[PDB]
Ligand SMILES: *C/C=C1/C(=C/c2[nH]c(/C=C3[NH+]=C(/C=C4\NC(=O)C(C=C)=C4C)C(C)=C\3CCC(=O)O)c(CCC(=O)O)c2C)NC(=O)[C@H]1C
């Protein structure tokens with residue numbers, strides 16, 4: 030549920046700063062980048078309605094001349110096959126493409142609702158093949174990543190290439206970095222969510238590619254801006270040539286980036302990460318090379334979807350011997366305290382939690398480094414109010430009085446069998462983030478160097494297998510409840 | 515857990531028929547197809563050990579001459595970059611490739627354990643626009659027929675089919691792009707045996723294999739046994755591998771000169787094949803083969819999105835009925851008199867013809883159900899069954915269940931109380947399903963008949979949709995919570 034957008038600047042809407050850029054209508058700029066021209070057309074008749082101001086440059090004849098022509102006349106040879114590709118009411122993620130001649134031009138076309146949007150830019154006319162196999166036999170998330178980043182750099186010759194992966198909190202972390210020997214190294218830096226805003230993420234989920242060929246160049250509006258059909262903003266998301274919002278363009282200039290590009294790494298209908306890549310000088314990429322990345326980006330999604338899902342399963346098997354023992358031993362004895370209390374079962378080693386607490390039929394029993402008694406009892410009280418299995422790396426944030434006595438009471442992992450329940454406390458960790466410029470709030474920042482922060486109150490993150498293995502026990506444990514009741 | 519294989523024919527092993535072809539060592543033929551030559555080499559030194567007999571044809575100099583050369587000498591220009599691609603102890607699913615010159619030759623190389631295996635054969639906006647039609651393909655079928663059509667348009671095959679497997683290792687051709695004139699397999703289930711145990715396992719790892727000429731004979735090696743081990747050579751990763759003669763007759767018996775297929779694999783499991791045949795002999799350029807290999811792995815990533823989504827859209831169609839039955843069940847003490855009410859539409863949730871309810875001794879029924887003394891015996895068996903029981907044919911999971919088929923055919927059972935004191939069940943009536951085999955399903959050798967065989971199996975019932983199976987378990991979580 031991302032925020033709904035304001036009207037644009039060219040329709041009496043407000044102007045942009047840090048506060049309101051969350052709700053910016055990026056998809057309707059009414060303008061494009063100069064490196065290529067752009068025409069719209071009527072869905073049914075094929076009449077050309079809107080043209081770019083620079084439509085006389087690539088085509089070779091003025092906007093006033095062609096503002097009213099029909100595609101049957103202008104593109105007589107393409108128009109027959111073109112319509113067969115783009116049927117009425119289809120998605121906008123469908124792109125037909127062919128090469129053209131003029132006294133060459135690569136042509137990208139798509140359809141949104143009832144309006145056809147054409148794209149025009151030049152074309153010059155075993156890399157990915159061998160690469161694709163190194164992706165297959167890449168033994169883990171990281172190996173994949175660095176092999177993947179390296180591949181894009183070798184193929185496109187960028188000055189920088191990074192594999193940005195997002196987080197649960199919309200932030201990210203550059204996990205892999207192929208770059209020029211000389212440039213600053215972002216590798217291993219978390220950037221805040223705000224750097225890629227709410228709607229941008231949602232637009233990159235549907236459309237898998239966008240770029241900026243020249244950061245300093247100015248935009249080129251349309252003729253007219255409003256779609257004569259609707260008399261309203263034009264949906265330009267599916268177009269490569271879309272005008273990148275000025276906010277981000279300064280963000281790019283403030284790093285020192287002439288040409289930028291990125292590709293969507295999407296898995297399970299959700300924007301998982303980006304392949305970020307920057308150049309120094311202005312750089313217009315041939316359509317062939319852009320398509321080669323678009324294969325590699327969707328390809329790279331299918332590997333993550335296999336490399337993540339597998340790398341947890343291999344960890345899952347490492348903690349199923351301890352699960353096997355605790356399955357049988359728990360189902361035997363009447364005493365629920367005096368079975369799980371025993372260090373033979375290694376009830377701490379299953380989670381690697383610094384402390385634990387056990388509650389069964391009134392008695393509260395503890396083991397490991399745990400807070401004092403009057404503290405614990407108040408911690409029991411809150412867990413009774415909490416609905417639903419509770420898990421957090423910072424208890425202080427989910428409970429204000431929990432930030433107290435941090436040495437022991439920092440992290441947490443709770444499960445219910447709240448009369449008879451389990452819990453695993455975790456000690457405080459002095460984690461040290463690596464932001465690329467700080468995380469508090471003027472405009473877009475000029476500092477992008479290695480900022481640290483030493484946030485206290487947070488603890489070691491629970492691994493996907495450590496979260497799930499606990500729930501597997503919850504199924505088999507509650508089944509042994511009836512032997513008492 | 516597939517069957518372990520016999521030794522080959524060229525090492526004193528037994529010969530092949532229908533009975534024993536399940537345990538055939540297809541991966542070690544010790545021979546290849548003539549359309550391209552094949553050389554092995556030492557992993558460390560790069561010395562050439564084994565050569566094909568026809569290695570003098572493409573290369574241009576005899577086997578006796580080069581049987582003992584080193585790759586530093588033979589391929590001086592490739593050898594440096596080649597080793598960097600294939601590090602020691604890597605997987606065999608890694609293929610380096612470059613183009614060559616001779617007084618042209620595409621070169622495919624891979625590494626298994628400690629032996630390098632080279633492959634040699636000639637070389638002379640389609641996939642781009644296609645790839646997008648895959649994205650906006652609205653469903654499993656639309657995807658399929660668009661996908662099959664694409665391969666046919668791209669390769670110009672006489673036939674192209676999207677074979678999808680089943681839980682029972684059978685399949686069903688669900689899409690078919692073909693020449694106007696050829697017999698239509700579209701919609702035909704073939705039995706599991708047609709693609710055997712190990713073959714499926716070998717197509718999981720290696721995503722492509724072919725046959726460029728069905729009638730042509732194989733070309734052995736020189737020597738057959740790997741001088742390193744003195745043992746069979748692993749040729750699975752090679753495109754040029756000799757297709758086992760059994761299948762080659764199976765292909766001839768349909769009337770297929772050139773065949774090819776690509777693995778559609780999802781979640782580490784062989785989901786389906788893109789089957790494609792030609793009439794005349796057909797050696798495909800390596801470029802075109804690679805284009806399919808993109809499209810096949812690509813097509814895997816779309817199924818993994820199109821299946822997983824198309825169930826979620828169905829799941830939402832039966833969560834209003836779930837929402838009502840969540841609240842109404844948690845209210846009343848009477849478990850019978852709440853779920854008995856036709857207001858809750860407890861039949862409409864599953865669309866089951868009949869149901870039965872058991873709670874605290876009382877057995878209550880609704881819908882077309884079998885007579886009382888029958889039901890009571892059906893209760894007895896469910897108490898013996900461990901674990902949630904589901905089957906489209908109860909007769910197969912319970913011999914006395916095949917009786918009284920009109921009502922007692924299909925089944926879907928769930929437990930609330932541990933054991934079977936308080937539990938649910940949904941019976942389903944018998945369905946006269948009509949299969950479309952491409953030649954019959956009983957057991958000489960490989961069959962000559964591939965026409966449209968039907969069977970009218972009685973005892974089976976409508977299959978439970980993935981959402982209908984899961985929605986019932988979602989209720990089981992929320993229902994048992996109202997037991998206390
Ligand atoms: C308050 C407004 C802000 C501005 C908004 C903004 N930014 C984008 C597009 C991107 N921002 C990105 C952030 C990064 N750039 C990097 O180089 C790295 C890491 C090395 C990060 C984390 C990225 C990657 C993009 C995508 C575009 C691209 O890669 O070239 C938009 C949407 C632009 C559009 O296409 O419509 C907006 C509105 N940026 C801010 O940080 C805040 C202050």
Ligand SMILES: *C/C=C1/C(=C/c2[nH]c(/C=C3[NH+]=C(/C=C4\NC(=O)C(C=C)=C4C)C(C)=C\3CCC(=O)O)c(CCC(=O)O)c2C)NC(=O)[C@H]1C
Nearest residue numbers: 532535704708709710713757758760761773774775789960
């Ligand atoms: C007793 C042994 C038998 C033999 C088993 C067998 N099958 C294969 C490989 C394949 N079999 C296939 C069967 C089909 N081809 C189709 O076109 C359709 C449906 C339209 C089916 C069900 C297919 C597709 C393959 C993959 C190769 C291909 O044809 O593209 C092998 C292994 C051969 C090899 O790769 O070396 C073996 C041993 N087939 C039988 O039917 C039984 C008699």
